[PDB]
Each structure stands twice: as C-alpha cells, then as structure tokens.
Design a protein around this ligand. Sequence first.
Ligand SMILES: Nc1nc2c(ncn2[C@@H]2O[C@H](COP(=O)(O)OP(=O)(O)O)[C@@H](O)[C@H]2O)c(=O)[nH]1
Ligand SMILES: Nc1nc2c(ncn2[C@@H]2O[C@H](COP(=O)(O)OP(=O)(O)O)[C@@H](O)[C@H]2O)c(=O)[nH]1
Lengths: 424, 432
Amino acid sequence: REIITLQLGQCGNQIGFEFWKQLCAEHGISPEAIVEEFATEGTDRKDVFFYQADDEHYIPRAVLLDLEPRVIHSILNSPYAKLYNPENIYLSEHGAGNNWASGFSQGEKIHEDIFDIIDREADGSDSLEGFVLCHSIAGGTGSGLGSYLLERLNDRYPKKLVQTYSVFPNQDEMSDVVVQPYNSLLTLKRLTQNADCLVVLDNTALNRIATDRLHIQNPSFSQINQLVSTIMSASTTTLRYPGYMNNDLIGLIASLIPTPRLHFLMTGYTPLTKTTVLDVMRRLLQPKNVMVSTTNHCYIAILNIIQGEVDPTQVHKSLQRIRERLANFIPWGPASIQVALSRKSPYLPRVSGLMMANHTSISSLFERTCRQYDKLRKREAFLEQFRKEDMFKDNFDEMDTSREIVQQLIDEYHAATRPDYISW
Amino acid sequence: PREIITLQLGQCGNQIGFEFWKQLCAEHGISPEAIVEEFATEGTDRKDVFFYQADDEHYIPRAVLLDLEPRVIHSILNSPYAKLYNPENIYLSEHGGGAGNNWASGFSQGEKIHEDIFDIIDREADGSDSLEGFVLCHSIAGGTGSGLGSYLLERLNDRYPKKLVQTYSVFPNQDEMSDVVVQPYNSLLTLKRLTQNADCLVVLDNTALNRIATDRLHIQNPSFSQINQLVSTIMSASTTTLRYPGYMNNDLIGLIASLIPTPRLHFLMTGYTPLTSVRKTTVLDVMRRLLQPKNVMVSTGRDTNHCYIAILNIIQGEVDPTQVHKSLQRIRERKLANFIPWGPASIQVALSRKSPYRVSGLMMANHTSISSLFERTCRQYDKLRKREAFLEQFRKEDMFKDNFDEMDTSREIVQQLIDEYHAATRPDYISW
Ligand SMILES: Nc1nc2c(ncn2[C@@H]2O[C@H](COP(=O)(O)OP(=O)(O)O)[C@@H](O)[C@H]2O)c(=O)[nH]1
Ligand SMILES: Nc1nc2c(ncn2[C@@H]2O[C@H](COP(=O)(O)OP(=O)(O)O)[C@@H](O)[C@H]2O)c(=O)[nH]1
C-alpha cells in the first residue's frame, strides 16, 4: 500500500529532504537513487515510499511544492538532486510572504498544476493507502497552501488517509512574525477536520533538546531537522518493513487514535544525550525526552517502536510496570500500550526507542495558540494583509469559525481526562 | 514470567477444562503423565505460562479442579491423564451432596469451603513469579459452575484486585427445553457476576455448538464429548498468543485491552474454521468464513445496527505475513464487518504455525449483538418470576430465605449491561 509524501514551503521541503536522505541510508539506496551493491537483498520493503523504476533504480513517491525557489534550488544543487522525480517538483513564480490567506489563495490559482502531479502519482499507485504532509503551521506556504491541500484531499480522495508532520513555531519565531497566531489557528482548523493523524513537531522542545541534551548552542534548522528526520523515520518503521500486519497506516491510526477527533500525537525519543528494554521504555516516559513542550492530563494510547537487539521475554515486565506505576492513562478504558520490536538497519553505523503517544496535554499547545490569537483578534491587530485576500475581503468569519473549531477540540481533550467521557 | 491459573468448576467446567489440557499437552509435546518429548527444542514455546515443573521434572498444569460431586473428577483420575494434575489442586466437597443444579446451593457451599479452596488458589498464586491472572472454566445454567463460580468471582475481585479474570463460560442451549427448570435464575444470577467481576468473558453458546453438530455433522442429539471437541479446539486456539513467543501485544493484558477497550462491554464471541480438494484454502477463505454467522459460536438471531467493537483473527498455517496482510486489506475493502460508528474499525490478526507434533483460523470478537443472549435470559427470567415458578429450592438457602432482592439486583445490573450495548451501536455513544 503506497504512501505519497507532500512537502510544502521552506519547512516542509527542508524536513522532507532530511527524511528522504535518511530513508535512502536505511533502505540501501544511493543519493542518485541506485541500489547499493551491498543492498541487493534485504528485510526492508521499499514499495511504500519508493517507486521501483528499474531493478536497480528507486524514486521517492514525493511531491515538492513551494511558492519560492530558494529551498527547491538548494535540493537541485545537492548530491541528492537526481533522486527526486523532476516531474514531481512544482515551483510557482507568481511567495506567500508569511500570510496564510495569500498561500491559500495561491493554492486556488495553481490547483490544476498541483493536482496534475498528485493525480498522476495516485493513479500510478496500485493500492494507495494515503498521503503524508510535511509542513510548518506558522508560515505562509505550509500554512495556507497546506490548508488548501488538506481541504482538497478530503474532497478529491475521500477514502484515503492523511497523516501530517506539522511543525509548531518557537518563541523567537513567534516574536519575529507577528501574524503567526493567525496562520497557526487557521491551519489548526484543517488539521482538526481534514487530517486522520497529526504528528506534532514542536520547535520549542526540539531546540531545548539540541541545547540541553546535544549541547549545541544556537541550533540551526539543519541540526533541528536531524532530530526531525529521526522521528519521521522511526515513526514510519512499521510501514517500511514487512510483518507489522496490525501497524500499517490504518492499523497504526486505529490503535493510537481510538478517539477520531483527538488525533494529535507527541513523540518521545531515547537516547538523546547495558541498556535493557525496561530502561528504554522508562526513558521514553521521562518529560525531558518528550519532544513537545506542554495532574489531570493522561495517555489515551502509547506505541513504542524499539530498535535494536532486546530480550523479548522482558517486554511484558516493562509494559506491566508502566501500567501499574510515570504513566497516567484514561479513566474510561484500559491502558493501551503497545510495542513494535524492530532492528536497526544493517547498513548504518545499540538500542533506541521512539514513543508515539496520544496524550491529552497536547491541548495546552492549542490553548497557547488560542491565547495568542485572541490577544491579536480582539484588537483587530495586523489584519490588513489578510483583508487584501479573497477569504477576508468582507469579514473575518473564517477566523471566528477556526477559533470555535479549535475550542471544540480543546474541550474534548479535557473531557477525555474524566470518567464521564463515557456516560456509563 | 506471566503465569495464568485455570480454575475448573462443576461438570461442564471440569469436562471442558480436561479437554483443554489434553489439547495443550498434545501441542506442547507433553505426555499424559507430563513428560516432555525427548528432543524438544528449547525456547520454542512458552509452556511456563500454563505449566510448571515438578521436583522430578514432569510438567504440571497450573490448574485447580473444583466440584461438589464426584463423577467428573473421578473420571479424570481414572484416565491416562491421572498423573498430570497436581493431586493437591483437586478439591471435591461432597458434604452438601452436590449443588442440585441450583445456583444458591453452589454459592452457599462456596462460603463453607472458602478456606480449603483458597489455600489451593493462594498456593498457586503465591508460587507464581509474576501472575497475570485467572481463567475460570464453567457453565452458567447448573449449580456448581454458576453458584460456586459466582462466589469465586466475587472473592477474586476482593482478594486479587489487581489480577485479570477471564472466563470461558458455557451458556445453555436455547433451542431446547432443559430438565433444569431454574435455568434462567441460575443464568441471571451468574451473569451479574460475569458483568461486574470479570475483565473478559468468552461466551461459548451451547445453542450454536449444538447446531454445528446437528446441521453440519448430521448428529441429531450430540453428546457432550462430541460438542466438547469443538470447545477444546476453540479454547486452545484462543490461548495461542499466550503460550508462544513473539506476541508482545497479545499477552493476557494486551489481548484484553485490544478486544475490550470498553471495560463493561467485555463479552466475547468466538468463531472457527474449519469446524467440520481441487484448490488449497487461502488465508482470505479463512478470514471471510470467520465473519459468516454460521461459523460464530453464539446464536444471536438472523437479520440490524449491531456492530463490531473489535476483532482478532488468529490464523494457523504455513502462510507468509504478506499473504495474511493482503487478506486483511481485502476484508476491510469488501466492508463485510460492520463496526462502531464512534471510533475506527479495530481488526487485528495474529499468525501461528501448527504444532510440530491446511490453513485454519479462530475469531475472537467483541460484537454488540451478544446482548440478545442476555435479553433472552431476562425474558425467560421475567416470565418465571411473574408465574412465581420454581423458587422452592432457592428459598431453602440463606440468601433467599427472607426475600428475592438478589434476583432483582441481578436483573437490573444485567439490564444496565444490555442498555450500554445498544448505546454502543450509536454515534452518540461518545457525546462529541
Ligand atoms: N523544524 C524546522 N522548522 C522550520 C524550518 N523552516 C521553517 N520552520 C518553521 O516555520 C516557520 C516559518 O515557516 P517557513 O517554512 O519559512 O514558511 P513557509 O515556507 O511559508 O512554510 C518558522 O518560523 C519556523 O517555525 C526547518 O527547516 N525546520
Ligand atoms: N459444552 C458443554 N456443556 C455442558 C457440559 N456439561 C454440562 N454442560 C451444560 O452446562 C449446564 C449445566 O451445568 P453443569 O456443569 O452440568 O452443572 P454443575 O456441575 O452444577 O456446574 C447446561 O447448560 C449443560 O448443557 C459439557 O461437558 N460441555
């Protein structure tokens, strides 16, 4: 079951690039897309993310879109320039200029060009499972164009799953672009209504990790994106190897998200700074290892992907300790903790783990966005550029509607922490 | 370590329990006297979950056999499997002269033998390095399985409050009038305890098991040993992920959590294929047939908005994960299984190879139509109470001497269960 990856704007294209470089390494594929001599056979399944053009040639099922040339041009001048399908790269002359409404309106104008690439890649798939969107929620392209695409995919491919990797801004990034709470809230509306699973990538927490744990003072996007490609790579493990019948994309979502509307996941990772499976799983629960910055709140579900050689007789003990001890779960159903045992790629130069968690404290992130938006909105601050666009020419009803949809999301999260979430 | 202790009560529980252990011994290469095959590979299974080793190296079922009458337990001790069970785990109390197929008599006798039985249970529990929990084998329509079973469920709740309790509960044949006229009373009183004091209940409907025998094997009035061959096949398959390595999300806790995300709606139905040339049967054939009502061993009536909460399929055969995964993808795409409207479809698959010592499959499912069984018991119980019929032997017992409040409480608790099952079929089950 194929997955098509859509990369939007500076952020989405820059994190997409690291993700595909990482997958190439793992799947024994060269920067030019040619099977490595040592990798003619393997345990891995390339079919999901890569198209097989030849016996020896592999192309990413990836669509690259931006409204500015910079990032796509960097990629086309890199050692990985030949990897991507040149017909899958779209670049618009016309930027989104840090404005959601401009990015969104630009989507409308460039619809047919975008979906000539998407439709072709979809119709070229034997059994398409769904789409992965990589983007920032705070800029102009990843927010506006991303939001346009989410609505369009919902109508054009109603039976396909949409998973996103959505980057939430830093405080430094928030203060630099004053309209970000608007772009963010507007994007959160489509992430709430038009995505099946959203992996929250939080620049605040990612920066904190790079400084406190990796000891990198003043971390660049390149360095931050190393942690990002690690999450994205680790979280697609069960899709990239055979034998995880219960954890194809449909299966992953079902277990992590038994609550359809509460589909925002946070990630944990170890080692960030002799090790057993008990240690790895204990570490994944430590707040300092959790990659979003957020009593009462609880786990809806946990999936630990554990990579490396482990004593599998000890997995029960680790899981059970977590149920009966660090980990607070929903009061209206059983504790849902699952493990997927994996081995590290033999092509790579140790035991590690990724936690994918559905935790209600994620709402505090959306609460913050709502507070920053309210401070601006209730002074009609910085709305002039939005007004110049079609969606906001007459009024800001689209904003008031986004605001209420995100409030309904937040309300459901708090309600999920209580036994009365189910009236029985 | 993740030990499971099995408790077998009454005629039915002991009869199905005995068949279950015969089957486990055969699959794990253990003789009727508990001696493992000479050339057994190490770390190839997880015998330790259901068996322990005696001083002399012979394997012993972690099993407690309880009855208020001698027949079945004496058969087991005159069989070739006489030396299999721990003699200290066999308890027979004949002082009250059996439970007389009456729930009150069985429950009341439980209270009298409490210390003797819990000396046995506590011993097995305390002897476990890391006990997962208990499995009860019994029927609900007799006296010992139902009444003593109900007593033990209440006691386990208080005594081992953190341990899982799973039951394999045999439900009475509804297509026939029984010689036990108090069947509905026995059934409802037990259902109250299965509702409140078990984490998971595997319902084995004699109505459906009989129909298989009558209609497919063409045996008009099948013996218990004929229907128990079906039961042992199902019960042994249903523990496959517990006694073999590589199912880390399907230990007892993980099995229950995935099938029962709704804590109170914890009654499971089972299906199996083949229960009874040209081209080999595929994984797809097996999985498709596990959704056919005739292969599911509860009789719910044919028609509705009843739906699956969860499905597990355990596939046995020499097939590749990708074949099973492609089959699972087609079962989803053909929309054969109707699921809850308030959450995603939950359908899981486990794959296993047949014992060393031909694709087949077991379904374990949480489906809301199970409530129709409880409704039939309520209906039969209501008619009897209105007629004030067959209460004589109940009133002879302490619990029912003054009044029938215990019956009224059971009736309402079971009604609350039924109402939540019907609520589970609606989008508004979650108010968001
Ligand atoms: N983690 C990460 N975040 C980024 C990157 N580039 C941009 N961002 C985030 O996205 C925001 C600006 O979005 P940008 O991608 O430049 O706008 P866009 O091109 O219109 O999507 C910044 O304020 C950061 O929050 C990147 O390479 N990595
Ligand atoms: N499937 C099955 N059902 C049984 C067996 N023995 C009795 N039953 C059923 O169990 C109920 C009566 O319970 P029974 O175990 O005989 O009475 P108890 O000894 O007092 O617990 C009725 O529904 C019988 O049809 C058996 O070996 N197999």
